[PDB]
Amino acid sequence: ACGLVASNLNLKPGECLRVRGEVAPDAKSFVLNLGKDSNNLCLHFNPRFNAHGDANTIVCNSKDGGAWGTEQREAVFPFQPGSVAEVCITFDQANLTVKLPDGYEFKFPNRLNLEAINYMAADGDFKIKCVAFD
Amino acid sequence: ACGLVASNLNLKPGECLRVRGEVAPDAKSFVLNLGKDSNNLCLHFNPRFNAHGDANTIVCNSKDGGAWGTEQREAVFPFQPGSVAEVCITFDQANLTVKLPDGYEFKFPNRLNLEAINYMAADGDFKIKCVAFD
Numbered sequence A, B: 001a002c003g004l005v006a007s008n009l010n011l012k013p014g015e016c017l018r019v020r021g022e023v024a025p026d027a028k029s030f031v032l033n034l035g036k037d038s039n040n041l042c043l044h045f046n047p048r049f050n051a052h053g054d055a056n057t058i059v060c061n062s063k064d065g066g067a068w069g070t071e072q073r074e075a076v077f078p079f080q081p082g083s084v085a086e087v088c089i090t091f092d093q094a095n096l097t098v099k100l101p102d103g104y105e106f107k108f109p110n111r112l113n114l115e116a117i118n119y120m121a122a123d124g125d126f127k128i129k130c131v132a133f134d
Ligand SMILES: O=C(O)[C@H](O)[C@@H](O)[C@H](O[C@@H]1O[C@H](CO)[C@H](O)[C@H](O)[C@H]1O)[C@H](O)CO
Pocket: A044, A046, A052, A053, A059, A060, A061, A068, A071
C-alpha cells in the first residue's frame, strides 16, 4: 500500500520466495501480503511488535474477494526492531510454509486453493532491500 | 508486460538498483522499463538480439506522457542468449548510469523531471531471478 508492490510474480508451487528487509528501530508493525491481487490474498503476514493491543505477536489471515478470513495467531516472534530480517515463503495446494530467522517456521493453510502467487505487497515498518526467486 | 511489474520502488538519487535474470536460449529481445508509470519512463532499456531489423544492439529511449523520445543506440552488446545477466542502474538529475556485464558502463540523459524512480517493468525473453536495492 505504501511499500513495495509487485505483480506478475508467477511464483509456482515448490519455488522459494526470499525477502530481505530492514526493520525500523521504532517498529510497531509490518505487513507482507501475498496472493492473486490486492483483493485475493492467500497470506497476510503481520508481525505486530506493539499494535492493535498485540505485543510481539505474528497475525496471519487471508482475503477472499475483498473479505478478510479468520485471524490466526502464531506462537513465535523472532523479530527485533532496528535489525535486518529475512523471510522465505513457499507453498503448495494445501499449505503455505513460512521460514523465519533463527530457524523458526510455521504453516498456514492455502484457503484460496491458489496454484500460482502473482502478487506481493509490503507495508508498515519494513524496508525491502532484496527479493529473490529460487 | 508479461514480466514482473514493481511500483513504489522509491529509488532515490545515488541509490543502486541491481537486477539479475536469465536470458532465454532463443531470446530475440528483452525490456527493462524504469520511470514514474507505464506512460512516463526515464529509461526504456531494450537489448535486441534479433528484433525490428536490429541484431545485437542495445536500444534506449524515454517515454514522456505516452510519447516516445529520441532513440539512442549503444556500441556494446555483452549479452548471451541462454545465460544469466546482471544489470545495475543508478541515477541523478542529469543522467542514468547503466552498468552492464563485462564491466561496460554508459550514461543515458535523464529527460524527465523525476525526484525518484517508483516504477519498474520487465518484458520479453528475460526472467527476473533477483532484485536488490543498494
Ligand atoms: O485486535 C484484533 O484481534 C482484531 O481482530 C484486529 O486484528 C483486526 O485488525 C485488522 O486485522 C487484519 C488482519 O486480519 C489486518 O492486519 C488489518 O490491518 C487490521 O486492521 C480488526 O478487524 C480491526 O482492528
